[PDB]
Point group: D2
């Protein structure tokens, strides 16, 4: 279980493990590659032989880090910064950046040692400033550059000491090679896409539970229908729903509102949009974005702009927009569930113990989700279109906004993780109460389709509610703190717990 950079193109899943799970990294030993990295550096070195002095050109690279140390706001997540580093390294491996393998290694060291430089959320228009923080740390330039050494705050100089590493001095091109690029916004992005694909799957699971709690038909997902409107996204969603409801006893076998009957058609564009995004982010992830680019094969460098993260800004905008759609569609399901007029017989607000009259059930939980869903649509607004044309002395008359747009999508995913918790809770309670209305007991497992049983049980495990035919998930209002179950399911989903593993089969289907 070790990730090797340089040989094969990195995938989103690779970046996540290394960033989130602490996985180990190893730079390929391929001579071809190492020779390309060394070849690009000599080109720069040879450029100093002919003719801008080595000493002046190195001071320039170093003073660069200094005026760029103007980040503000909260700090990025340690996983976001780790992913950025991984991508920076991966980039310099194509050997067109003219950077010292020794530096391409300083990263491998920090990554495997658990050192993560601190980075602010504000500072990039789409990643000079942010990368200037990562760089300053790597080379131990000064104590003002703080980092996170496996748990506590240290300064870069102290970290290098403890790593038995010697501060470094930026060479001719190395500053631009380090701080010119889209590695941080693209790293923040890879993490969002991942999380998004997860929530998506869970989303699919939540509707599955909902449809069973509503006793809706499965006819809506018959292939013929979707083979007449062959959008690959719709095709995929209908199919995954047909299977998720396989051998179900809570679903009628063969009237249903559009949130159920048009589910595939609705989810379709989002499923397709999310794959498009993924594919585009992977390409950014394996691109060379510093400047200028060294073409060793023709002994010449070019001055272009692969440092504009347009794909990340546009891509993250869309993603927040799909999140907002997913959530509003879910909120509509809950709406039907809580209403006796539309839930097809379920108790109002999925109340559990009708015996006690004070019980209100999940009415408070719905209001809570009613306050989150709009916010998600609010975050569905774009930012790439609001770029400042006067930026950086008018030289950056166009910019991507990729960095903040990425951070915005991270704020959405986080909120949507909370939202999913609330949804999961509604579906677990619904299938229990549906089971009881049909069989007389609250053991949903005896009637749920096998595919949704895994998710069902995964959630009860996480909240700490023990499967029993004598009682449903929520019985009385005074018997639990709903807020605790929200936080627990959130943390689970965020850490990749049992609930996530439960949707493993859907996330890989994409």
């Amino acid at each position: 279980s070790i990730v090797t950079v340089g040989d094969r193109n990195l995938t989103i899943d690779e970046v996540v493990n290394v960033a989130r799970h602490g996985t180990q990294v190893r730079l390929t030993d391929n001579a071809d590659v190492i020779r390309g990295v060394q070849a690009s550096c000599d080109y720069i070195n040879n450029a100093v032989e002919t003719a801008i002095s080595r000493e002046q050109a190195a001071e320039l690279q170093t003073n660069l880090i200094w005026f760029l140390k103007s980040g503000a706001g909260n700090k990025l997540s340690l996983a976001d910064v780790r992913a950025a580093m991984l991508l920076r390294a991966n980039s310099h491996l194509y050997g067109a950046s003219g950077i010292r393998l020794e530096l391409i290694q300083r990263i491998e060291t920090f990554l495997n040692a658990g050192v993560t430089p601190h980075v602010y959320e504000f500072g990039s228009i789409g990643d000079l400033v942010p990368l200037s923080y990562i760089t300053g740390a790597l080379i131990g330039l000064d104590p003002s550059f703080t980092v996170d050494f496996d748990g506590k705050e240290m300064d870069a100089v102290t970290a290098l000491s403890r790593l038995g590493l010697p501060k470094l001095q930026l060479q001719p091109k190395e500053g631009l090679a380090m701080m010119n690029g889209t590695s941080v916004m693209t790293g923040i992005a890879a993490n969002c896409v991942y999380d998004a694909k997860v929530l998506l799957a869970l989303t699919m699971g939540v509707h599955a539970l909902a449809i069973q709690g509503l006793y809706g038909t499965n006819q809506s997902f018959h292939p013929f229908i979707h083979q007449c409107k062959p959008h690959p996204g719709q095709l995929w969603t209908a199919d995954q729903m047909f299977s998720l409801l396989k051998d179900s006893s809570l679903v009628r076998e063969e009237q249903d509102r559009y949130s159920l009957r048009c589910l595939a058609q609705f989810i379709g564009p989002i499923v397709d949009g999310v794959s498009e995004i993924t594919k585009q982010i992977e390409v950014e992830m394996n691109s060379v974005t510093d400047n200028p680019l060294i073409d060793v094969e023709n002994q010449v460098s070019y001055h272009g702009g692969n440092f504009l993260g347009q794909y990340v800004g546009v891509t993250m905008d869309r993603l927040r927009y799909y999140i907002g759609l997913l959530a509003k569609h879910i909120d509509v399901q809950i709406a039907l569930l809580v209403s006796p007029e539309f839930s097809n017989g379920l108790p109002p607000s999925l109340v559990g113990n009708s015996d006690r009259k004070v019980n209100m059930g999940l009415k408070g939980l719905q209001i809570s989700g009613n306050s989150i869903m709009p916010l998600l649509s609010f975050y569905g607004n774009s930012l790439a279109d609001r770029f400042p044309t006067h930026a950086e002395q008018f030289n950056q008359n166009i910019n991507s906004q990729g960095y903040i747009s990425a951070n915005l999508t991270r704020r959405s995913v986080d909120i949507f993780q909370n939202y999913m918790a609330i949804a999961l809770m509604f579906g677990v309670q619904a299938v229990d109460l549906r089971t009881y209305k049909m069989k007389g007991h609250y053991d949903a497992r005896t009637c749920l389709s096998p595919n949704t049983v895994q998710l069902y049980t995964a959630v009860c495990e996480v909240v700490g509610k023990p499967l029993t035919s004598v009682r449903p998930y929520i019985w009385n209002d005074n018997e639990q703190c709903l807020d605790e179950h929200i936080a627990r399911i959130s943390a689970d989903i965020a850490g990749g717990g049992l609930i996530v593993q439960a949707v493993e089969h859907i996330f890989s289907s994409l």
Copy 2:
């Protein structure tokens, strides 16, 4: 030059010709197909044999048209309605709608006779109401249904007479088959995508002219750069720019602002997004969207929801968003052009006759474009996320907003056609004044790259300005009405004139 429906899947280009150019239509004679259409109808007929009475079930289909005649607002464009019809027909040809070939023909007749039923812009949430207007006309149900008979307003009953056609009476399933679907929003959509691909190409041409008026380098578009960040969209744009500047004398051969240096990276996502859209719209265009769907092969019908135009609403949202991006990027180019501080030597506001001191040049034309560009970004806001959850007695708790979203994108394309006119004007004046600064004469053709020469001359032809080395496009302020040239270039672009033909080579490159 005749379009045949039923045999091969329709393409955007096919729908445009038939809708915009009046091209002729012909339903394939393939027995397999015709048999499928007849087979689906017998299934319905046989359903009345067993068991809801023929007379009651036909009155139902007819009363359907009546309560649905509640459209409001302005009328759709005759081409939008023609495209809708074409798509309706094309749909019933898969033979899963259980509709009479005689009706699938009533369309072919209207299309080839130049009859276009009137349709309101308001009425669909994503196309019952709109299709109810097309239907009512086809069958001559009543005089209240007005149409456009090759030039003037007639009523449907009169139109059928003059066509020697007999009013028709809706059979069992035929109402739903006609009025249940996404043909109108998908028809409005196909027309936008088309126009968008055109404006895009022109956009590429306008930057080409701009870059030459600015004497910018072509190094920014060298393949190496873009092969290090291989986004297919970026790859395509850089390449098309490298060629568009081929053998140019106004461009320096090898500092440039980002609007020039990052042009490919910026345009990239938009070029890729627009192809994704196109592909998705073509799939909607060749889908069966009425309901229920008749599966003759297994003698059974299904009740689903391929009538949700989610792909059209999501797709059109994105498109308006790309239009807004394109335009704001263009406005930034103009900005550099008009400013002596950034234009690299050009006269302020591209004034022509410096001799006369009252001349202000294109300063008024820039302010005009400055008022349009923001509006385009404003239209870049979405609508698919604002769908009403309480719609149609709460049964349509989810809807696409495809119809209005489509109309919104039509309003954008229209405005952006005006905007492009203003841009083209700026680039024509710029290259003339750049030529004079370098050569001493105003004959840009002697220095423009061959690829941009075609577009260059196409615009001068349209505005009526005669190529001469003794004077530039705009000389004095009192010698022309800029508003006239805007309208002329707009109309040209909208009708597919010389200017469009000039970008033929770029539109087909996609």
Copy 3:
């Protein structure tokens, strides 16, 4: 009935009559005023005596009109242009613009003669270009300047002839005095505020009808409640609702959803916001916005920027935002009406003739309103925040977007006029069907509160439905074209017909 400019500050109502109703204008004869206008001109004249030559400074003023003739897009409404003119005149009357009374009169002449110069919708960033069109026409500068002479298209030169007027030649400062300002966007604005105040009142009437069709209580509007939360807007709305329901038999006397119980609290901010706007627009309307400003009293001119219509852009943004709120609140009322589960006994979709089973009632009309309401919220997005910082050679690094923002609010009002028609229709049908459920007959007038009776009857008059206890407004689906009634009620509301007069008592209450 004659409006006199110069003596008292113009009010919105004054501008509307003159613009919409063709009312006559008369410049006050107050010597003080006329002396101020003449005094400001001598200051300019005297500035040429001392020292920029009279001939050169007049050519400048004239060439100004020429490069500014670059408008694009559709044409403004004749009433919008008439209001602009009225405001231009009114402005030059404070006598700080240094303009010839003869010109301040050329307007009075065009206004009273029914001459309206043509003006494009695109061209201003917030009104040089637009005013350049009005100016060019006034002085008959050239035939390219078209106008509207009481019915048909004439050119300015021909219009001046027929008016027995002599083309004029712009003096020293007169160009800037004419074309520098916020008269056109502020004129478009005054017309919107007006219309908005109307729709608002009607809105109040529509809820009144709705509440009675729903048999809701009037207790929600008891003063105590609103005197505990004394927002003047809420106070006003509750009160106007208490009265609008006075002596009603369809309302229960003393459970209700929030759309009824929180109506005042909801409408409150909108009522207050709309008054704030009005007040702010009136102040723009009576301001001097050309530049520079001549201070005759201290013999000195100042160079400032009262030409930034920030209040109009900000104000119109808000207004579209309030329109979107109003409409979405209305759509929620309709939702309850159409649903038997929430309408309190009404037939589903307010169907009229239950005898006939094919009848679906207003189900198609609701879907139509369901497609308009979202669009209104879509138009609720802002534009003032999207101003281009690079505009006009970077000199207008800040601008109001007032002009387009104004046009956008005009597009909203227009659509919302259509929407109100659909709402009015729902409430008329609802009270009829409520009456029948309570009394056994369909004569709502026998039970409606006197205040809503006027509006009720005003709508039936407009659609052409005759009051009878034997039948409701909509009986069968095949007996009328709902689209016709929408258009008729719209036109009525837009022209200020019977329906508007019916809400006279509410519009003046503000």
Copy 4:
């Protein structure tokens, strides 16, 4: 220095001191008032005498707190919760809520003891859930209710013990009286308005510095101009600018871009909008919002909806929108400053030590502000228009979104505090470098207008830069961490430090 609730209406400034500064509270001793509170309770008590049992009606009030404990997301700020409490109390003092003075006192105790119940950011649609957390804590209902006892986390039961308080049991109406209202969103709101008025003033100070760094004229702010366009907001801004530049040597005495020449006209609507808001928030702050309302004077209760915080949701929306405008206008100033072409002679990017060639100056600081400003406009989007119509079993078909909208405005203010820090830094450096260009030394105090001198020095004090004519604020790039100065100035502004006191004279002018 003690705040007394009940006698006079609370003002924003009152709520801030108590919430932010820990000020002491004291309930008035006015017999009239206390009698009104006691009178409303007897009405409820007497309602149990006649007739729903005391025991059942108290269990209901208690079970209410339980199902409402479903908050999610991060926790509100201790000051936001303190303000909410203060407002809750203040409300029950009008004596129309039928609540026990003993409870109205439990707040006074928590406020003065420094106890602050924990509250989640998610849960209200506009404040049942949030207030349910405050309530549960007050009465020590259970340990799950955590609080903040002067520094560390305790549970409510433990807090009541240490306060020598006896858990309480909710009486007949008391639950609704506590948890039905707009105190939390209105408390979060009062804090934002305050902060906003502060940033505004500072904004005025930052332009003052900017205008002097640019050597712009003060003529733009001459009263005549603004007395011709008498918008009270514009009038106020011009005046405050005329004074802020009083006796200045860095400003030319009498060409300027619009960001300077139209500053008053631009800022005007924002200044007026912010006062409107303030006034509206104060009215919410002193309103009774629980339900039903007890009218002791007529012995009757009413069921209405003063619990809809429409004014807060609408008001906060606008405020974020004004923040976005302010910031984008500021960013445009900085743009001019950093550019030698537009700064009127200043060094590019306000570099300090031109001797050293590696120095880049504030170029990195501008890019940082370039990434924040767009985000602020992004937050300028609304939320009140996106309310969910299906909320709470369709009973809350309309809602304000006040709570989240309030939280959103809090996120804006926070970011804008960071932004202002970056702006202040630019203006301090600019006036130093302007002084040197004019006088030969870097002691700006010798030339700055007295009014801006206070702010100037307040910022240098905060960053720790000592006034000296031998060096400017930023000399070399390697001599300071710009990020440190951003954070320091932010914290200062947020805590109300020297910098804020420096604008005291402007904040009170409103």
